[PDB]
A paper describes a structure:
Mirolysin is a secretory protease of Tannerella forsythia, a member of the dysbiotic oral microbiota responsible for periodontitis. T. forsythia secretes a family of six multidomain proteases: three serine proteases (mirolase, miropsin-1, and miropsin-2) and three metalloproteases (karilysin, mirolysin, and forsilysin), referred to as KLIKK proteases. Mirolysin, together with other M43B proteases, archetypal ulilysin and human pappalysins (pregnancy-associated plasma proteases) that hydrolyse growth hormone-binding proteins, shares unique specificity for Xaa–Arg and Xaa–Lys (P1–P1′) peptide bonds, and thus is dubbed LysargiNase17. In this study, we show that mirolysin latency is achieved by a “cysteine-switch” mechanism exerted by Cys23 in the N-terminal profragment.
Residue numbers in the entry: 59 to 177, 179 to 327
């Protein structure tokens, strides 16, 4: 497979000094996305051998924009002082300059990552099916305490995996347990993710079983699309990789336009 290139702009929207996170912290997150989406994450050593053969390399590269929407030079990082103290998922106010946030850069050409103070919410995504109706709010929001790996990020969500999970949703992946409140009925529509009752939290011991997969090697609680601690997640499946890449299909791909100028938007 050929590398899919994603131009990124990180909108730091800060009401105080703590929210105005460091360049190092932002570069740390860009690096984590590149590791997790190219299976160059060192904690792939924690992937059980039973699931190692299902492990996907998405071969998606994330580069900070070097050309802004007016065609001027940028480092792909915006900093917006805000009078708003906590942002709302329901309002999407972080995504509008008009409401004390920062307007999206053309969502057909850039992945917009908003960093801000959110309401015990780690972050939220918008799914591709919503793009036609909600073009301005396409992208990913991350809580400033859970952006980037180590540094200023707070345990136990301190390895940058909130953004990996949210970019997952942004590329059309569903919760591995099927958003069915614990049943075996719901599906993530991925053949190589074992059927799973409910979400996992914390760091379960391998193997974790439930009424849906009651046998070793159990459910893939170390999948990025579960709700487990950052240090206890370490793969996408080949099935998940195919779903994500299909959005960039040159004929039918919802996000295909992103590839046309990706190189020019990320090259000096
Ligand atoms: N572990 C990934 C993740 C992303 C977003 C919200 C979450 N709640 S708990 N785990 C989450
Ligand atoms: Ca599945
Ligand atoms: Ca389920
Ligand atoms: Zn989720």
């Amino acid at each position: 497979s050929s590398t899919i290139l994603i131009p990124v702009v990180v909108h730091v929207v800060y009401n105080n000094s703590a929210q105005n996170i460091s360049d190092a912290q932002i570069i740390s997150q860009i690096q984590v996305l590149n590791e997790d989406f190219r299976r160059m994450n060192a904690d792939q050593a924690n992937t059980p051998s039973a699931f190692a053969n299902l492990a996907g390399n998405a071969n998606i590269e994330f580069k900070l924009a070097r050309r802004d929407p007016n065609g001027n030079t940028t480092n792909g990082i915006t900093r917006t002082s805000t009078s708003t103290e906590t942002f709302s998922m329901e309002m999407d106010n972080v995504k509008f300059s008009n409401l004390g946030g920062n307007n999206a850069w053309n969502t057909r050409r850039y992945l917009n990552i908003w960093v801000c103070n959110l309401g015990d919410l780690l972050g939220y995504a918008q799914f591709p099916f919503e793009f036609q109706t909600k073009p301005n709010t396409d992208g990913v929001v991350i809580h400033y305490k859970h952006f980037g790996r180590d540094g200023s990020a707070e345990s136990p969500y301190d390895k940058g995996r909130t953004a990996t999970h949210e970019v997952g949703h942004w590329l059309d992946l569903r919760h591995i347990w099927g958003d069915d409140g614990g049943s075996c009925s719901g599906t993530d529509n991925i053949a190589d993710t074992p059927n799973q009752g409910g979400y996992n939290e914390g760091c379960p011991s391998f193997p974790k079983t439930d009424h849906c997969t009651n046998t070793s090697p159990g459910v893939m609680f170390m999948n990025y699309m579960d709700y487990t601690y950052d240090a206890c997640m370490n793969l996408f499946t080949k099935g998940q990789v195919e779903r994500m890449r299909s959005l960039f299909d040159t004929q039918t791909g919802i996000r295909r336009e992103m590839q046309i100028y990706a190189n020019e938007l990320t090259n000096p």
